[PDB]
Design a protein around this ligand. Structure first.
Ligand SMILES: C/N=c1\[nH]c(C)c(-c2nc(Nc3ccc(C)c(S(=O)(=O)N4CCOCC4)c3)ncc2C#N)s1
Lengths: 257, 296
């Protein structure tokens, strides 16, 4: 609270430096956005099974996107990239990271422990060890401090929305985490309480409903079409009482902007 | 960024739970470095992954500089700038002379600077003690050993409970607080500040409860007045002896009024009242701060 601004400022600077290449999928010969949605959905499953932090999952997705931004990968190796990213994310963020054997186990023994570790090494190289990336989650928790008063359904809905964005490279790869965080927070706050992006977050972030609008429009459609999405692990996850079953809430029909 | 081809080992320096440290000379540039070797069956250790990534973000005069990472088959070599010794060694050597107050003031000022920087970049050190503060022959002191460090969030989550070397561990960790923060690093510096003045540790406990009791006998046993929420902390006990707080001037007798003021703020029981590294920089204790060079 004596560093909240310093840290926000710093994270805002770093999210630009840690941003994936917006159009990297066009340059991927073998893989597609849909395959990526499949991998990310699975990573949510893995997160649940090992009770990993949400932050860990966000980090792992940051690592995958940044890696695939400079390295071509065949579809048969995409999961290996993902496994190693989750492993690294876990090592970075978790009090007790699942052991390597456990990661080797959840890939249905598609890959050897030796491959998983070699890929870990390669990922570190390609990211030059820059793992402390800003995430939607990091911005959300700061934004939550501006509630009056705090509302658990809103935080869980926001988390849920922020998390849905990880699935679809198109279009969310073009929005910075701090912006998806803002869109998610306003959408959750509106859905649950009917209120809006608070004046105090405008002072803090410089973002307005107007600047958020483009991301907000996408995220709104994502929210509306969620039950029809091919990938369903985030909705299953947020049916849980841990997150106040917010996936079961009804999305607003109109945002009115 | 090259390979070990250009490094010439000069001598071993010491060891870590993961690393072996050598003094080395770059043969083309003449630069003296400290090489930390990390041998690699669970892949790259988490501590090494934290240390490298956080350290690459922290470029500061009072943070030890990671110069390079040589990442090979079975070996990970971290290349650090070379510093001459640690604060612990210096205090020992300064046995009978004592450390001149202007040099204490200087070191503390510098340490608050490096620390404020860490906290400004959402990093907790979590292992500040004289063994991890390195000094050079030009008056600088720098935080080192970011193996226990952690990237934190706002507001903090629950992180590893088993943190900070015992003598320098904050009461909120001892009492099982689910949510410690930057204040734990300030607690540690408070202990180091007192230690530089007396040249003996301030709370040399041999166990957790011994550590708590030693703290309590010095600062008074905390109650809901001095520290709201204390009695509902997990490892707090109603049977705790209730000691009076002693006059702070007896805690570190050689310290002047400004020094005492500052020390007391760094050792406030309530993490929320405990002064931040940032705010401490502006304390009157530092009004005449300079940068003396120490003695070999
Ligand atoms: C695990 N401990 C260390 N890791 C690194 C990278 C260290 C370091 N060392 C120096 N130079 C230096 C030279 C001589 C001595 C005696 C000392 S020491 O007093 O701190 N000493 C005490 C006994 O254990 C070994 C180290 C340090 N410079 C930079 C770094 C860094 N980073 S220490």
């Amino acid at each position: 609270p004596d560093y909240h601004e310093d840290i926000h400022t710093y994270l805002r600077e770093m999210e630009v430096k840690c941003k994936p290449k917006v159009g990297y999928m066009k340059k991927q010969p073998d893989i597609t956005n849909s395959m990526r949605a499949i991998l990310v959905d699975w990573l949510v499953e893995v997160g649940e099974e090992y009770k990993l932090q949400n932050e860990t999952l966000h980090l792992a997705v940051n690592y995958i996107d940044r890696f695939l931004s400079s390295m071509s990968v065949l579809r048969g190796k995409l999961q290996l990239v993902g496994t190693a990213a989750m492993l690294l994310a876990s090592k970075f963020e978790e009090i007790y990271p699942p052991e390597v054997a456990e990661f080797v186990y959840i890939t249905d023994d598609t890959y050897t422990k030796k491959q998983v570790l070699r890929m870990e090494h390669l990922v570190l190289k390609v990211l030059t060890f820059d793992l402390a990336a800003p995430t939607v989650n990091q911005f959300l928790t700061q934004y939550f401090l501006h509630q009056q008063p705090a509302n658990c359904k809103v935080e869980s809905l926001a988390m849920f929305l922020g998390e849905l964005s990880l699935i679809d490279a198109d279009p969310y790869l073009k929005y910075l985490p701090s912006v998806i965080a803002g869109a998610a927070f306003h959408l959750a706050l509106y859905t649950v309480t009917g209120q809006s992006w608070p004046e105090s977050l405008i002072r803090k972030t410089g973002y307005t409903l107007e600047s958020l609008k483009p991301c907000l429009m996408d995220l709104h459609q994502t929210y509306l079409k969620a039950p029809q999405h091919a990938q369903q692990s985030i909705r299953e996850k947020y049916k849980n009482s841990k997150y106040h079953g917010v996936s079961l809430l009804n999305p607003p029909e109109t945002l009115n902007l | 960024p090259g390979s070990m081809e250009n490094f010439q080992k000069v001598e071993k320096i010491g060891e870590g739970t993961y690393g072996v440290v050598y003094k080395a000379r770059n043969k083309l540039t003449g630069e003296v470095v400290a090489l930390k070797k990390i041998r690699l069956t669970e892949g790259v250790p988490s501590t090494a992954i934290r240390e490298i990534s956080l350290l690459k973000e922290l470029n500061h005069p009072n943070i030890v500089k990671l110069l390079d990472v040589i990442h090979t088959e079975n070996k990970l070599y971290l290349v650090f700038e070379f510093l001459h010794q640690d604060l612990k060694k210096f205090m020992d050597a300064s046995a009978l002379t004592g450390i001149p107050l202007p040099l204490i003031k200087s070191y503390l000022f510098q340490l608050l600077q490096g620390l404020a920087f860490c906290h400004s970049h959402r990093v907790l050190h979590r292992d500040l003690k004289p063994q991890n503060l390195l000094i050079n022959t030009e008056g600088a002191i720098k935080l080192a050993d970011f193996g226990l460090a952690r990237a934190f969030g706002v507001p903090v989550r629950t992180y590893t409970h088993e943190v900070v070397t015992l003598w320098y561990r904050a009461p909120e960790i001892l009492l099982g607080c689910k949510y410690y923060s930057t204040a734990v690093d300030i607690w540690s510096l408070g202990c180091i500040f007192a230690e530089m003045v007396t040249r003996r540790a301030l709370f040399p406990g041999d166990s957790e409860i011994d550590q708590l009791f030693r703290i309590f006998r010095t600062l008074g046993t905390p109650d809901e007045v001095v520290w709201p929420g204390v009695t509902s902390m997990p490892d707090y006990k109603p049977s705790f002896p209730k000691w009076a707080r002693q006059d702070f001037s007896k805690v570190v007798p050689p310290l002047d009024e400004d020094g005492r003021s500052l020390l007391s703020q760094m050792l406030h029981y309530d993490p929320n009242k405990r002064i931040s590294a940032k705010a401490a920089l502006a304390h009157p204790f530092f009004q005449d701060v300079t940068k003396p060079v120490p003695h070999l």
